[PDB]
From a paper:
The structures were solved at 1.5 (C2221) and 1.3 Å (P3121) resolution. Crystals of both space groups contain a single copy of the protein in the asymmetric unit. Both structures are almost identical with a r.m.s. deviation between both crystal forms of 0.5Å for all Cα positions. An r.m.s. deviation of 0.51 Å is observed for all Cα atoms of the two dimers. The second (2 residues) is in the tip of the long connection between β4 and β5 and is juxtaposed to the best conserved sequence region (see further). This large conformational difference in the connection between β4 and β5 with B116 is obeyed for the two crystal forms of AFV3-109 who superpose perfectly in this region. We modelled this density as a glycerol molecule, present in the mother liquid as crystal cryoprotectant. In contrast, a glycerol molecule could not fit into a residual density present near His45 in the P3121 space group.
AFV3-109 is the most conserved protein in different families of crenarchaeal viruses. The structure of AFV3-109 is a five stranded β-sheet with loops on one side and three helices on the other. It forms a dimer adopting the shape of a cradle that encompasses the best conserved regions of the sequence. Although the function of AFV3-109 cannot be deduced directly from its structure, structural homology with the STIV1 protein, and the size and charge distribution of the cavity suggested it could interact with nucleic acids.
Numbering used by the authors:
A (entry chain A), B (entry chain A): 1 to 109
Write the structure that this text describes.
Amino acid sequence: MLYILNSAILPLKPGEEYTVKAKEITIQEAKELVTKEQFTSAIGHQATAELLSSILGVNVPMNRVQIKVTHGDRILAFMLKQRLPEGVVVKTTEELEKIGYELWLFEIQ
Amino acid sequence: MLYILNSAILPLKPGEEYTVKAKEITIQEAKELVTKEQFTSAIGHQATAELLSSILGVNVPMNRVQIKVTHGDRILAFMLKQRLPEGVVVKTTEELEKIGYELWLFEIQ
């Protein structure tokens, strides 16, 4: 399964050791990824869901659930370029854009 | 550098593709790790710093800073077993223990 996550987290299923491939990708590559297979959003902030929906051209719901990844899964991760103060949630796509972000693809094996 | 992080985040330096090895470890293995080489804490919640200091027997400061990892670095990650509501910070080691956690070692190459 391809998961879309709102941070660069690697929520691995216990019981196994893993090798993870990681690379940064463009918006267009990310768009192609989420267009050509089923994805599961675990995006947990409204503004992040709104921004990802816009840049990817698909419905990225705000779905604040715990997911675990295991062998064969992939993660599209939205990685904000700064660390936020404790408890702070960025409420606008405008602020997310000014802070800046990277899109990463993690492939779990 | 060995970093101690308060979530299972993989804050990779852009400009390169990576292979990351990941496995769960015991408290004793984690203790040995942080005892035998220099570490840099980026723990960003008081209760998590207090808990890690206790279980590892070393000073794990609360140091809420952005760090990036690259080839040759390792991460000791504290991974809480549940996802928290938006903006919520767990304020007691007692609650962290009841939720439960895993310690993961990520080796970045």
